[PDB]
Amino acid sequence: GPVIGIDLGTTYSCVGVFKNGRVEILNNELGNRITPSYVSFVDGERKVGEAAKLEATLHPTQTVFDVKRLIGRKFDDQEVVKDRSLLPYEIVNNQGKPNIKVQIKDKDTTFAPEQISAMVLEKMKEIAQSFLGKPVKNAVVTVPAYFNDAQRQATKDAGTIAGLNIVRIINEPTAAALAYGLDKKEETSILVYDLGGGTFDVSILVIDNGVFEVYATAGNTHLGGEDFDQRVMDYFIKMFKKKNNIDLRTDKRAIQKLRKEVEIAKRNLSVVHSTQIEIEDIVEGHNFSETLTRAKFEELNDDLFRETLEPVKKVLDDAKYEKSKIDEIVLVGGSTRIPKIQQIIKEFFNGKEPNRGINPDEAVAYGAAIQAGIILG
């Protein structure tokens, strides 16, 4: 049978196959290589991916996401207490563990995190099956290096529910190191800087004669590209109020349309210096039309960008490493395409350039597919 590779991310998943000596990262049915890790339970229908994420605006309590934050944890863990206060869907205490409670045709229905992760895995499986034109029973799935045995087992149990035998769990730093094809000979120390949509992770990964070991991990569980978008949102909501006497927060639809254009403007500003954010009738009879510059984008987010260095100092300290001891810096996550992020890391490493890919959102799934290939020989 085939073995596919799946990056089960906090905010998104990504699936790759190894076939005819190449890794193919697969498109979902909307033509995207990244699928939002969302599941909606509205109006007697269950949706997974972007179609579910679009329900979050009008049905926030029925639109489940960020389940990776809960999986294999305890209801009373300090992190889960925080996540319950942030997440808009109901989380209940089932015998010491967080479960998700929603309604299906008005009936209360409770799910383990691994039942919701299983639905994401099922969708990635179906993309692979369609593409390979055969059934898929086996996968390599990625986890964060800091995941404990209960978090790993809960991820494997998600696979079993989705009809996937997870033949190997590999950590996200190792997957990145496989994708970038880092030389496995001799000893090299690698700083893997992973800045995603919602989470920041940094790891020191040591490769020694083909053996991969994560010597230290740190991060910020509530720092990612979505926060940079929110800083921009906050700025233009204040401006629109000043100019128009309209508080766009009073209209949830207006906020949804703004967040979509702000996320595009942010991407543009990784390449250009100035971009237009435009929504016709953001509310009836009022257009939104603004310019954002890279300089203002950076100014709005500079403290968040610099916060990413605090986990870098922590892993260098935990590992008793000098900065010079790092041989190579590898960037993962779309947010590492931000020029200021790259500059800040370079300058922290007293001038050393970070290695980055071209598709840093897909590098982990790519490495998971390589690992699948490695396992089949």
Active site amino acids? 7, 68, 172, 194
**Which residue from 192, 139, 89, 135 is spatially nearest to 365, judged by alpha carbons?**
139
- Asked if 227 interacts with ligand Q8L (CB under 6 A), we say no
Pick the closer one to ligand Q8L by CB: 10 or 115.
10
Pick the closer one to ligand Q8L by CB: 167 or 330.
330
CB contact at 8 A, 63 and 52: yes
- Asked if 219 interacts with ligand Q8L (CB under 6 A), we say no
The rounded distance, in Å, linking the Cα atoms of 125 and 265 is 33
Binding residues among 236-265 for ligand Q8L as defined by CB under 6 A = 263
- Give one DSSP letter per residue of 34-72, joined into a string: -EE-EEEEETTEEEESHHHHHHTTT-GGGEEE-GGGTTT
- Asked if 361 interacts with ligand Q8L (CB under 6 A), we say yes
Give me the sign of the Cα torsion angle 81, 85, 88, 94.
Answer: positive
Taking CB under 6 A as the criterion, the residue among 5, 225, 311, 373 binding ligand Q8L is 225
Pick the closer one to ligand Q8L by CB: 16 or 224.
224
Question: Total residues contacting ligand Q8L (rule CB under 6 A)?
Answer: 18
- Asked if 337 interacts with ligand Q8L (CB under 6 A), we say yes
- Asked if 335 interacts with ligand Q8L (CB under 6 A), we say yes
CB-based contacts of 118, cutoff 8 Å, min separation 6: 158, 159, 161, 162
Taking CB under 6 A as the criterion, the residue among 16, 72, 144, 196 binding ligand Q8L is 196
Pick the closer one to ligand Q8L by CB: 99 or 335.
335
Taking CB under 6 A as the criterion, the residue among 231, 241, 259, 267 binding ligand Q8L is 267
The residue of the chain with the least Cβ separation from ligand Q8L equals 225
The window from 146-154, 285-293, 313-321, 331-339 that contacts ligand Q8L (CB under 6 A) reads 331-339
Tokens of 254: 């207006």
CB contact at 8 A, 9 and 364: yes
Residue 311 is which amino acid? P
Pick the closer one to ligand Q8L by CB: 171 or 342.
342
Pick the closer one to ligand Q8L by CB: 112 or 202.
202
Pick the closer one to ligand Q8L by CB: 247 or 347.
347
- Percent helix, percent strand, percent coil in the chain, to nearest 5: 40, 30, 30
- Terminal C-alpha separation, the chain: 13
Taking CB under 6 A as the criterion, the residue among 333, 354, 367, 373 binding ligand Q8L is 333
CB of 271 to ligand Q8L, least distance (A): 5
Taking CB under 6 A as the criterion, the residue among 271, 272, 295, 376 binding ligand Q8L is 271
- Asked if 197 interacts with ligand Q8L (CB under 6 A), we say yes
- Asked if 334 interacts with ligand Q8L (CB under 6 A), we say yes
- Asked if 310 interacts with ligand Q8L (CB under 6 A), we say no
β-strand partners of 170: 142
- Give one DSSP letter per residue of 164-213, joined into a string: -EEEEEEEHHHHHHHHTT---SSEEEEEEEEE-SS-EEEEEEEEETTEEE
- Asked if 49 interacts with ligand Q8L (CB under 6 A), we say no
Tokens of 101: 């409670």
- Asked if 364 interacts with ligand Q8L (CB under 6 A), we say no
> Which residues of the chain form beta strands (DSSP E)?
3-8, 12-19, 22-25, 35-36, 38-42, 45-48, 63-65, 90-94, 97-104, 107-111, 138-143, 165-171, 187-195, 200-208, 211-220, 274-283, 286-293, 328-332
Residue 251: Cβ-neighbour burial (10 angstroms; 0-12, 13-18, 19+): middle
The window from 116-124, 133-141, 267-275, 315-323 that contacts ligand Q8L (CB under 6 A) reads 267-275
Q: What kind and span of H or E run contains 155? A: helix 149-161
Pick the closer one to ligand Q8L by CB: 219 or 333.
333
- Asked if 220 interacts with ligand Q8L (CB under 6 A), we say no
Taking CB under 6 A as the criterion, the residue among 270, 310, 349, 357 binding ligand Q8L is 270
Tokens of 19: 């076939």
Positions that interact with ligand Q8L (CB under 6 A): 12, 34, 196-197, 224-226, 263, 266-267, 270-271, 333-335, 337-338, 361
